[PDB]
Symmetry: C3
Subunit: 57 residues, 3 copies
């Protein structure tokens, strides 16, 4: 699978392109992985990038 | 007690609601822990979330 | 040399002061170290801090 970091990298690139729907899709999938794993570091990583994407868009 | 990541997750959610005061107190604690452990990953994590929290209105 | 995290923390501080020239110099170094390490966590860290820096100026 893609790692959380690859998913979040691609979301940031898509957000830079103004591609909201595809960016947000990748964020939901990264959040799903982080929450399934109950992984605090993945959770904060996703949470930070979620905010950054919103401001970028 | 709560890890740096957990404190930062809570700080972001309070700041998004509007409660700046307890958000900042969680940032202070997260920073205290990160500096005490002398952990550079935790320090940049705190520093980024500090910026994102202080960014919201 | 310095770690990626150490360069990024300082790049954020320089960007806060409006020193885009110094900030971007340390970002360039942080990115080149992260890229010879093939570290996906360092890559997303560099990417996030790049965006925050470029948002403040
Ligand atoms: N490890 C981190 C990567 C990125 C930058 C900072 C905050 C978030 C997002 C987690 C450190």
């Amino acid at each position: 699978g893609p790692s959380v970091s690859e998913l979040l990298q691609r979301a940031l690139k898509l957000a830079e392109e103004g591609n909201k729907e595809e960016a947000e899709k990748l964020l939901r999938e990264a959040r799903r992985i982080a929450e399934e794993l109950n992984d605090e570091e993945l959770e904060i990583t996703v949470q930070v990038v979620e905010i950054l994407v919103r401001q970028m868009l």
